[PDB]
C-alpha cells in the first residue's frame, strides 16, 4: 500500500550537486553487464538508479558515445 519508491540517500554523494551520481551509476551498470554479469537482477539495481536523475537527452548522448567507441569514462575493465 506504498507504491512510490526511488533511490535513497547514497551517502557518498551527499551534497546538492549530483552531476556524478548520474555518471558513476551509469558506468557501474555498463561495467557490470560487461565484466561478469552474474545475473540481470543484481546489477540492474544500478539501472534503477541512473534511469532516475539522468535526463533522457543525456542517456542517448552517452549511448552514442559508447556506440562509436568515443565514450569518455572507462567501461571496459577487461
Amino acid at each position: 500500500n506504498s507504491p512510490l519508491h526511488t533511490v535513497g540517500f547514497d551517502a557518498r554523494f551527499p551534497q546538492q550537486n549530483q552531476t556524478k551520481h548520474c555518471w558513476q551509476s551509469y558506468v557501474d551498470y555498463h561495467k557490470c553487464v560487461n565484466m561478469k554479469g552474474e545475473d540481470f537482477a543484481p546489477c540492474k539495481v544500478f539501472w534503477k538508479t541512473y534511469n532516475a536523475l539522468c535526463p533522457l537527452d543525456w542517456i542517448e548522448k552517452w549511448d552514442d558515445q559508447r556506440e562509436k567507441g568515443i565514450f569518455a569514462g572507462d567501461i571496459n575493465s577487461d
Binding site: K20, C22, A72, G73, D74
Partner: protein, 268 residues
C-alpha cells in the same frame, strides 16, 4: 642664496609638460577595439585593419617612451623623490600582472580538482597526450633560471664601473629571453592538442600563452637597456629603466616556477 635658489623648484616632484601621447594611445585603443570586434564577425574581409591598428598602438607607445627617456637624461627631472615614485609605481603594476595569473590559476584548479562529467574522470582527459615535464619544458626552466642568474651580475657590474663586463652580461641575457621564446615556440608547434581541444587545451594555452606574451615584452625591455648602455645613458647611481626590468625578470622567473610545477608536473 635667495636669488639663485628662487630660480628653481621648491618641491622635488616633477611637473611634466602637456604632450599628446595619452590621447593618441587612446585613439589607438578605440581603433583597435573597433577593428577587432568588426573583423571577427566578417564585416571587413581581411586581417589588415588589425595589423595596422596594432601597429599604430605599438608606434604611439614607443613614442611615449621616446619622451620619458628625454625627460630623464636630457632634462632629467627624476629626483630622489621621483625615482621612488616610479619604482613604487611599477611595483603596483606588477601586482596586477601577478594577480591576472590568479585568474588563470583558479581556472585550472576549478577544472582539475573537481573533474568533469563531459570528459573523463581523470585529468588530462582521455585521448589528449599531455606534455611530459622531463623533456624540453625542463630546458625551458634551466634557461630561464640562469636568466635570473645572469641579469643580476649585469646589474651589479653596472654599478661597479666597467661597461664591457656589464654589457656582456646583458647580451647573453637578451638571448636567453629569445631562446626561451623560440623553445616555447617549438613546443607550441610540436604538441598534439590545440586551443580548442576542450578545457585541457584551453586552460593550458592561456596560463602559458599569456606568459609567453610577457616574455616578448621582457625581451623588448631588455633590448632598450642594451641600447641605452651602449649609447651611454644609464649611470652608476641613476638607473630606473634597469631596476624596473630586474623586478620584471625575477617575477617572471617566479610565475613560471608555478606554471612548471602545476601545468606540467601536477598535471600529468
Amino acid at each position: 642664496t635667495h636669488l639663485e635658489r628662487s630660480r628653481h623648484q621648491q618641491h622635488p616632484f616633477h611637473m611634466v609638460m602637456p604632450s599628446p601621447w595619452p590621447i593618441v594611445v587612446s585613439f589607438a585603443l578605440l581603433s583597435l577595439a573597433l577593428s577587432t570586434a568588426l573583423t571577427m564577425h566578417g564585416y571587413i574581409g581581411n586581417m589588415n585593419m588589425v595589423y595596422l591598428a596594432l601597429f599604430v598602438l605599438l608606434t604611439s607607445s614607443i613614442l611615449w617612451f621616446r619622451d620619458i627617456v628625454a625627460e630623464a637624461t636630457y632634462l632629467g627631472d627624476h629626483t630622489m623623490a621621483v625615482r621612488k615614485g616610479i619604482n613604487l609605481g611599477f611595483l603596483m603594476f606588477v601586482l596586477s600582472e601577478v594577480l591576472i595569473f590568479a585568474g588563470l590559476f583558479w581556472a585550472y584548479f576549478h577544472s582539475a580538482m573537481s573533474p568533469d562529467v563531459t570528459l573523463g574522470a581523470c585529468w588530462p582527459p582521455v585521448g589528449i597526450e599531455a606534455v611530459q615535464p622531463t623533456e624540453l619544458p625542463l630546458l625551458n626552466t634551466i634557461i630561464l633560471l640562469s636568466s635570473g642568474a645572469t641579469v643580476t651580475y649585469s646589474h651589479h657590474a653596472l654599478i661597479a664601473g666597467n661597461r664591457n663586463k656589464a654589457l656582456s652580461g646583458l647580451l647573453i641575457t637578451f638571448w636567453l629571453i629569445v631562446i626561451f621564446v623560440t623553445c616555447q615556440y617549438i613546443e607550441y608547434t610540436n604538441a598534439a592538442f590545440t586551443i580548442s581541444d576542450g578545457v585541457y587545451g584551453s586552460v593550458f594555452y592561456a596560463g602559458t600563452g599569456l606568459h609567453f606574451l610577457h616574455m616578448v615584452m621582457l625581451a623588448a625591455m631588455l633590448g632598450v637597456n642594451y641600447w641605452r648602455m651602449r649609447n651611454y645613458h644609464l649611470t652608476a647611481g641613476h638607473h630606473v629603466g634597469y631596476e624596473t626590468t630586474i623586478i620584471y625578470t625575477h617575477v617572471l622567473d617566479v610565475i613560471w616556477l608555478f606554471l612548471y610545477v602545476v601545468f606540467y608536473w601536477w598535471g600529468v
